[PDB]
Amino acid sequence: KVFGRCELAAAMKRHGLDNYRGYSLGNWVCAAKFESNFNTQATNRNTDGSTDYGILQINSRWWCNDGRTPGSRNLCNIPCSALLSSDITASVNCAKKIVSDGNGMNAWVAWRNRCKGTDVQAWIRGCRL
DSSP, rough: OOHHHHHHHHHHHHHTTTTBTTHHHHHHHHHHHHHHBBBBTTTEETTSOOOOEETTTTTTTTOOOSSSSSSOOOOSSSBGGGGGGSSSHHHHHHHHHHHHHTTTGGGHHHHHHHHHHHHHHHGGGOOOO
């Protein structure tokens, strides 16, 4: 599923991401925009052989099992394919564990490079929330 901007914002808010660990909703929408262009089916392979999955491009090195990242961890206790669902619950629940890991949203390179320090509330302007 390819989300609309406000549609995703409302789904993320319902799942408790607004101000989760101090990160306002606009941060999460901005990260999803630049990680996946709001597409739950996005995948991208990394040089180390891991793969990033889903709307928040969660990596198989640490967070999910895809059966082809040897020696990797599965900290969210899920198959990576669960992160590609039109239902974002699994991605959100795993993102909550990532962002609590100590490095905050710096775990998302696109957030660090394209959202951090910008007017992120722009990503939720106009939405009925």
